[PDB]
Amino acid sequence: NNPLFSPYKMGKFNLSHRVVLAPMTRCRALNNIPQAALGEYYEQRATAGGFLITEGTMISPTSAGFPHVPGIFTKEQVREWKKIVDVVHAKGAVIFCQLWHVGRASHEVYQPAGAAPISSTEKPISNRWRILMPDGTHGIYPKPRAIGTYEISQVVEDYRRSALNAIEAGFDGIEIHGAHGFLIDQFLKDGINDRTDEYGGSLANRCKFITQVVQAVVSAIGADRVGVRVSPAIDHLDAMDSNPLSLGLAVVERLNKIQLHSGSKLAYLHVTQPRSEEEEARLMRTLRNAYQGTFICSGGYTRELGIEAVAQGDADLVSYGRLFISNPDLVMRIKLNAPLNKYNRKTFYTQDPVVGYTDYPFL
Ligand SMILES: Cc1cc2nc3c(=O)[nH]c(=O)nc-3n(C[C@H](O)[C@H](O)[C@H](O)COP(=O)(O)O)c2cc1C
Ligand SMILES: COCCOC(=O)/C(=N\O)C(C)=O
């Protein structure tokens, strides 16, 4: 028996298998409005009782750092998302909307009035990283504006309102993007967070922002409709921590406490790992062992590694990114151990509604 096809109860959601669509920015949501193409794309990948997580979705006009990423902060965005959610639900899938603020990982071209991006810090991402521009070239990350605690509470309210909007659009839940060097990770990581106020310094202070974001969306829509994604050991966009395991465990501690205080469990904790392998595996297993709830692992998984993760108790669910780009029927291919299609990096972030998006073939 393939352990990826044993059913799993993710809170109130009965999943038929453990293969999850990882959240992936694809830049087809032209001018930040969800498009019919997104409906075709997610419908292609939906399975009865399968769990899907959307591309990162803007919570406010200042939250974007990629072209043509969808928002969920306007009524028009909610209206267009509803159409996509309806077609996904008609295939029997569960779908969560990932709420995403990029913080300092942006550019004047993505900001209203060309304003500076916001962050925990005034320090820019270093020169070894470059941002994809709307014309397909790569540009320099600018200096961000470090926000005060009043503005922090406004961003928290943006997460809260976007979570309510996601439920209005029919989403089963939301995922907080707290990974990969974006805004929340810019508070978590001591390689970024140089604050001297109550949001910087100690582990507890660096965890304050993610705790307040999660608390706000839990209060708005319920813990069982909230998943949280973090990546303590991934240093994307200069997001290094001096002790990734300690940071990860501090986050897990706060999530366990939110659950006790709310009297209910989160939908899940979702952790991406970098790709020795043994040290990374032990870090992941330690986070899983410490967290009181459902654990989704992600990052470089294959059919074999996903089977092993569930069989060994290292994870409850396994999310796949790049192979799901090029294999719309990845779930069926994993079930049959069928050959997988190659994915084309060149069309990860282009705008065509078909080419490199919905034209990868089925079996
Ligand atoms: C094109 C692309 C877009 C991605 N966009 C997001 C995103 O919007 N939010 C997020 O949390 N992770 C994003 N990721 C990371 C994936 O969710 C996932 O963790 C990674 O692809 C898993 O590794 P795998 O591709 O080997 O399966 C993206 C990855 C790719 C390749
Ligand atoms: C492909 O990069 C691996 C980690 O994923 C990211 O950093 C990400 N979003 O989290 C985007 C939009 O790419």
Side-chain angles (χ1 to χ4, degrees):
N1 259 326
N2 189 335
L4 290 175
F5 293 88
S6 58
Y8 185 78
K9 180 70 155 160
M10 183 177 76
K12 60 173 179 180
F13 307 108
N14 301 285
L15 306 181
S16 66
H17 61 76
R18 321 282 192 111
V19 177
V20 178
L21 170 66
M24 287 178 290
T25 294
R26 305 299 306 287
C27 307
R28 270 70 177 187
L30 304 184
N31 274 11
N32 314 117
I33 308 305
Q35 307 282 307
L38 274 65
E40 182 170 7
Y41 170 84
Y42 288 115
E43 185 184 32
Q44 281 185 343
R45 287 155 183 72
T47 55
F51 183 32
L52 308 177
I53 307 161
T54 70
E55 65 214 84
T57 299
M58 297 169 70
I59 65 174
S60 75
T62 54
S63 64
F66 274 77
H68 310 298
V69 296
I72 198 151
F73 59 93
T74 75
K75 288 310 144 181
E76 177 186 14
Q77 290 160 350
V78 171
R79 175 170 60 253
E80 295 308 309
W81 271 122
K82 209 174 199 294
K83 299 175 188 179
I84 294 157
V85 171
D86 284 351
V87 300
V88 167
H89 278 161
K91 301 286 295 295
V94 174
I95 182 161
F96 275 31
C97 177
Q98 188 189 62
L99 305 182
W100 185 29
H101 194 305
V102 297
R104 73 182 180 166
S106 189
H107 186 281
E108 295 89 333
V109 75
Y110 296 122
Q111 291 296 319
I118 63 152
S119 187
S120 59
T121 181
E122 293 181 329
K123 291 220 63 208
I125 296 163
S126 70
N127 190 253
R128 54 198 165 265
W129 309 87
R130 308 291 170 86
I131 192 177
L132 176 65
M133 299 294 291
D135 68 358
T137 64
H138 286 78
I140 297 295
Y141 289 101
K143 288 183 70 279
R145 174 171 67 80
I147 58 171
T149 62
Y150 178 68
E151 188 158 355
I152 288 175
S153 76
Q154 296 178 309
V155 176
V156 171
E157 181 60 18
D158 290 336
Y159 280 102
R160 192 187 77 86
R161 293 195 188 196
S162 289
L164 290 166
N165 289 347
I167 297 308
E168 183 184 351
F171 282 104
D172 299 291
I174 66 91
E175 178 178 279
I176 294 297
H177 190 341
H180 303 157
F182 294 112
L183 180 66
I184 289 169
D185 211 28
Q186 289 154 34
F187 280 87
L188 287 171
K189 295 285 176 63
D190 64 4
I192 304 177
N193 185 337
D194 59 355
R195 301 177 72 97
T196 54
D197 71 352
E198 69 265 33
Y199 287 85
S202 63
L203 248 8
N205 287 3
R206 287 187 276 126
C207 289
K208 189 175 197 241
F209 184 54
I210 193 172
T211 301
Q212 291 174 334
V213 169
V214 175
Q215 279 176 331
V217 295
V218 164
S219 290
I221 70 170
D224 59 358
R225 299 194 284 192
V226 176
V228 182
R229 193 176 217 206
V230 293
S231 62
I234 288 186
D235 69 338
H236 185 67
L237 304 172
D238 290 337
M240 198 177 181
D241 196 84
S242 63
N243 196 332
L245 181 52
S246 180
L247 174 62
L249 289 173
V251 173
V252 167
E253 168 191 330
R254 272 85 190 160
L255 299 182
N256 285 344
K257 182 213 69 71
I258 291 173
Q259 293 182 156
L260 292 192
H261 177 260
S262 304
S264 51
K265 290 196 172 57
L266 298 162
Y268 57 83
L269 171 66
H270 191 179
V271 181
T272 50
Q273 63 181 96
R275 293 286 188 172
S276 71
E277 67 162 32
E278 207 242 36
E279 186 180 9
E280 253 62 7
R282 294 187 72 238
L283 190 159
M284 290 288 278
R285 183 58 188 250
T286 282
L287 298 179
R288 190 277 208 292
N289 285 342
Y291 172 57
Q292 302 176 8
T294 298
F295 191 84
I296 311 186
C297 61
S298 195
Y301 281 85
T302 60
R303 182 181 185 271
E304 185 178 337
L305 293 170
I307 289 171
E308 290 176 23
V310 175
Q312 296 169 1
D314 303 331
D316 305 299
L317 305 167
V318 182
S319 70
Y320 293 83
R322 286 165 299 165
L323 288 167
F324 236 138
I325 289 180
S326 53
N327 298 273
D329 51 355
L330 182 63
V331 179
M332 181 82 268
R333 295 186 190 230
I334 289 176
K335 179 60 183 176
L336 300 174
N337 196 17
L340 304 183
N341 300 329
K342 70 156 185 297
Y343 42 84
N344 179 16
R345 187 160 303 269
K346 290 189 186 307
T347 49
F348 281 1
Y349 305 118
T350 45
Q351 279 61 72
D352 199 277
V354 177
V355 174
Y357 195 52
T358 58
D359 64 358
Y360 286 101
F362 289 79
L363 289 174

